[PDB]
Amino acid sequence: SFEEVVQTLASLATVVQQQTIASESLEQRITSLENGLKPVYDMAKTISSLNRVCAEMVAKYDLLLEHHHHHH
């Protein structure tokens, strides 16, 4: 009947609306992760400071290692 055409086109329109809202709601979370990932690209500067401290700590053993060379 025609009331089937009316009832169905209502429900379908409501579900088409729910996709549009949920897609933009999903799309906010995609933009979020994209933006959340950006600062990790600047990790380079921190790893360089880690590289200082990794060598600065080893340099503390300079005199102890000098003794090793003679007495081993």
Binding residues for Hg ion, rule: CB under 5 A, are 48, 50-51, 54-55
Q: Where are the alpha helices (DSSP H) in 1-72?
A: 2-37, 44-59, 62-70
End-to-end CA distance of the chain: 100
Enumerate residues 33-72 that contact a copy of itself by CB under 8 A. 33-34, 36-37, 39-48, 50-51, 53-55, 57-62, 64-65, 68-69, 72
C-alpha–C-alpha distance, residues 57 and 51, integer Å:
10
Applying CB under 8 A, the residues found at the interface with a copy of itself are: 2, 5-6, 8-9, 12-13, 15-16, 19-20, 22-23, 26-27, 29-30, 32-34, 36-37, 39-48, 50-51, 53-55, 57-62, 64-65, 68-69, 72
